[PDB]
Structure 1
Amino acid sequence: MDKIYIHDMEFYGYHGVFPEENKLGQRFKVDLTVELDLKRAGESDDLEHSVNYGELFELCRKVVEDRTYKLVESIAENIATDILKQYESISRCTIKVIKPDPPIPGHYRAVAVEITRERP
């Protein structure tokens, strides 16, 4: 299926299992993929046949910046649920939530979770 992507959104948030993380905050990154037909939009040049990617950005920002969860899994799950609830034309989405600066002693680029969700 055709795809809309938003790559490497960066937010500052307060999610985390440790209370110290909830106090200090840290970077969170999100990669978004949504699956939908884009042919009608590409033939007509009419945005009403697609999904406004500015709205998709704001949907992600709300989950990461305006809420606080323990788990990155909860960020991913809530983004996916909100997308499918709000956009009937999107059949499936893949949400990757990245924690690049976790409190793990060691050397690495990032930890992340990734889920793919569709309706029943």
Structure 2
Amino acid sequence: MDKIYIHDMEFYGYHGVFPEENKLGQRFKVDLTVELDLKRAGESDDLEHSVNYGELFELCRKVVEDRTYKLVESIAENIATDILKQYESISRCTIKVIKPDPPIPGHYRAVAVEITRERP
């Protein structure tokens, strides 16, 4: 189905299991995909037949920056949950939450969680 993307949103949050992460904080990145039929929007050039991605950004901003969880998994679930609650037009969404600088002695690009959620 037609999809809207928001690529590589960068936030600074305080999520983590260690209390030392809650004090220091670190970068968190989010990739967003929402599914929805967008033919009526492109047919009509009318934004009410689509979804404002500027709001989609503010949703992820609040979950990552205005809150503090232990698991990045909780970030993905609350982001996806809040997407499906407020946009009935969206049928399904895939949320990827990236932790690029975790306290994992080693060498890597990032660790990440990725979920797909739809309504029952």
| Partner Cα separation in structure 2 for residue 58 and residue 17 of structure 1 | 25
CA-CA distance at 1:29 after TM superposition: 0.1
Taking the TM superposition and a 5 Å limit, the aligned residue runs for 1:1-120 are: 1-120=1-120
Q: Distance in 1 between matches of 2:18 and 2:7?
A: 28
Distance 1:19 1:49 in 2: 45
Structure 1 residue 40: Cα displacement: 0.1
What displacement does 1:31 show? 0.0
**Helix, strand or coil at the partner of 1:97:** strand
- Alignment length (residue pairs): 120
Spell out, residue by residue over 1:24-57, the C-alpha distance to the aligned partner (whole angstroms, 9 max, x if none): 0000000000000000000000000000000000
**CA drift at 1:98:** 0.2
Q: Which runs of 4+ in 1 moved over 4 A?
A: none
Aligned residue for 2:104, secondary structure, equals coil
Tell me the distance in 2 between the aligned counterparts of 1:77 and 1:28: 15
CA distance in 1, matches of 2:110, 2:100: 4
The CA distance in 2 between the partners of 1:82 and 1:66, in whole Å, is 14
Q: CA deviation at 1:21?
A: 0.2
Q: TM-score, normalised by structure 2?
A: 1.00
Other structure's SS at 2:108 match: coil
Per-residue deviation, 1:110: 0.1
How far residue 90 of structure 1 moved from its aligned partner, in angstroms, is: 0.1
Q: Unpaired segments of 5 or more residues in structure 2?
A: none
User: For 1:79 and 1:108, how far apart are their aligned partners in 2?
Assistant: 26
CA deviation after TM superposition for structure 1 residue 4, in Å: 0.2
